[PDB]
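Provenance

Sequences were taken from public entries as deposited. Structures were produced by running a predictor on each sequence independently, with no templates supplied. The record for Insulin-degrading enzyme from Homo sapiens is shown for reference.
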Amino acid sequence: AIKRIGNHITKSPEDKREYRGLELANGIKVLLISDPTTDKSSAALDVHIGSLSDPPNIAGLSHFLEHMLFLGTKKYPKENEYSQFLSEHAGSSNAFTSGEHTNYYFDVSHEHLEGALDRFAQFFLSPLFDESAKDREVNAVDSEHEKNVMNDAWRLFQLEKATGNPKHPFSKFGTGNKYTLETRPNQEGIDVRQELLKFHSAYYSSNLMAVVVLGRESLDDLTNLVVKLFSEVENKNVPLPEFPEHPFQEEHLKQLYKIVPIKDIRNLYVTFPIPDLQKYYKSNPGHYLGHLIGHEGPGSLLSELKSKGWVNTLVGGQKEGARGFMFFIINVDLTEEGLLHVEDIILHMFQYIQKLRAEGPQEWVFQELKDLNAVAFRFKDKERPRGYTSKIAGILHYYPLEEVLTAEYLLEEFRPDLIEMVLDKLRPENVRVAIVSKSFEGKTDRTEEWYGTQYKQEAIPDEVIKKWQNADLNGKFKLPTKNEFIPTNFEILPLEKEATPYPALIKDTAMSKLWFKQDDKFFLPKANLNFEFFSPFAYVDPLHSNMAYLYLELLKDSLNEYAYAAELAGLSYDLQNTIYGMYLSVKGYNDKQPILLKKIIEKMATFEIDEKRFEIIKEAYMRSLNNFRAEQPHQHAMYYLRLLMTEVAWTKDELKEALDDVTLPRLKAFIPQLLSRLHIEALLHGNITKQAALGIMQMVEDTLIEHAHTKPLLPSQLVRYREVQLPDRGWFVYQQRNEVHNNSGIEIYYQTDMQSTSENMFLELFAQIISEPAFNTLRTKEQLGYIVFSGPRRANGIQGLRFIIQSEKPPHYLESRVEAFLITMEKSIEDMTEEAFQKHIQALAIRRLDKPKKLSAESAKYWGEIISQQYNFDRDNTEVAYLKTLTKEDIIKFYKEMLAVDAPRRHKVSVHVLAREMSQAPALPQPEVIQNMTEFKRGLPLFPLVKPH
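Predicted structure for Insulin-degrading enzyme:
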């Protein structure tokens, strides 16, 4: 069905990816992407047949099909041959499932386009669906449902799915467990596989595909190469599954829900099913409404509710749905009085509605936000081929070949009748109510079928309703003002005589230390800025560190209402305390980072405290403290990991107890004593000069001395926390009992060495060789659990090796199979060929060597050097030069003394995290339990630190 008609596409003139749209007569939307500079080419395929056309008896049928569609062709009848053929050349495919789309996507190393796509076309002719793939994939879906047991957002999602019409196909169960996939069909005698051939043959083959290919060949060669390769689709004209009805058919409208959560959160959920604006994509009022609902500005509702201390956080806006209907959700957080004043909160919502009817539609907001989306669509660098292509393939079904780029980031007209129209849809007639509280006991009877949460309808009486319509007035509400944060800085600065690929120390004081590099590759007017604020007193005790955390938190929260337009404009930032000090990040364009940052320094320099705000934040993080008794044992294990492998560490218990004495005069008295004397080190990157960077730094520290008379630190109080030496052959372990969870955790750690050039490649190569056999035998074959991780530990200038496994086993049994995997690797040493060696180190080379794909990416790596003070900018080529000088016997000699069981250099330590009620193995030595970790470390030496490069 080879048909083509196209022309020039309005393509947002910064991309170099050459495009062409065309629609094939067999119902295939085709987009041609041509970027002849890309290393990796890609492709994506969407089928508009979704998970709403499933049979009513079997849930998640299309899910199990698109799993099983993967395995088996008539050309290659082997089981993993497509997947293993993508395992060869580093291409990571994935697929997902939606009510109206089913989408397929992959990538490839360089040229495997024709190869992999020929492996992919067969899928439509002959999928195989053999015994073993079936019987293991149903176990994989059941384990996916099992790990999706405790994710509460899907529980609330299904609670939306279940509290509507139980006849409407919105009431289906999306993923489907063991019970619905293979328990209802075989007790009814229905073959799942014949239904799979039914589904695939009748539904898929006709039309409604949406393909896109990122190829790097030309506009025409790849075009008549794949469009020749895809003529296999034959039209049957399957109709588009759309719904002529909404799923909330006035049985569950004007209704309330009372939810018992699994985590201790407090929320209120308001939902509006709303008609279709997919045809109204041209003006698209819903993005403007989503701008106006969750807006934070002068005289706003949320400004007042934060200002009254009633609302911690909120989110509202449009939820996408089916083709016929769409949704509108409002999800807000609750305080103590937020818990008691819920109806008045709804009143405040209606006050904002009264404000919206009072001022009607607005145009200057629409042109202003239109210009913001203009600039933001205007200037895009490049993209990740994954996630993007799945999104635009989501809208490839809905948009013409020129509208697939200009997707929603351009709006023709203003429709105030539409705004008023959906404003009329947003009424107490249309409200769905869901209350989330853990204080619901004995009162919520109706239990969930799959997961088991419990709720009650208990409809609102009519007094409050009629009270809701007549009492519609305004108080101290104002419309938010025009932004001023719009830049006209668009000028890219040409590179100067100071041509460096790495940031130079352009400013050194005893107060500061400043490193700088401008954008060589990406050429954007934007800039990224990284800042550490060093202070000695940060980790002196729990008490003041808590005060720092609360200080930084409520501090950041203060200007946040002002910060909303900047983050809304594309100016992102970060404030974060560390064990060392504070972490600042500034990311965005070049316009007003000095100006705004000046306001930031003056704000956190000169700050005042409210009393009840202090009480809420103090109590709120106090609730966040004893939450930490209940989390996942891997997170718990990483806690103990970073606990044991530092110099000093304050536990959560003494963090809980020490907040009993925290008064505000004590706090506000300590802070300027704290803030009296500190150090700042900073990385600045983007479109600027060196001298303007000096002025920004000068500005900052000037302001600092201006307010708090900051003087520099001593180079004897420039310290780090050290890492603990071991007695070179010893193995100690201890246990911790998890109260709640029935799973057990364990983590095993190895102190190799400092980061010398040899040890980096030792640990990387050893890490690479243990990935796939552990992947093959332990999780897959031994079926221990899902949490099975290994890897590096770059900490305190000391490299390290760690193994993270959490499964429900006896831990010494689990140790036995760990050591069994160690012996397995021991034999797998001598089983390495030369070829496996060479291809394996080439894999690690291309894994390590890559140019960055984001300015933030390389900045996080560089900043990771800066926090470790290493500065070895060309460690990559150095390590590769070492990497080429490595033998098999090198890692034998690395194994025998350092890694083997007969080792005089053995630095091995394990940690047990117990459960709620908790082919050859040698005689391991006896460890000892660790009752006092300080008294543990009492006779352990400390490591030196690194001479900085």
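The radius of gyration is 30 Å.
The chain has 33 helices and 25 strands.
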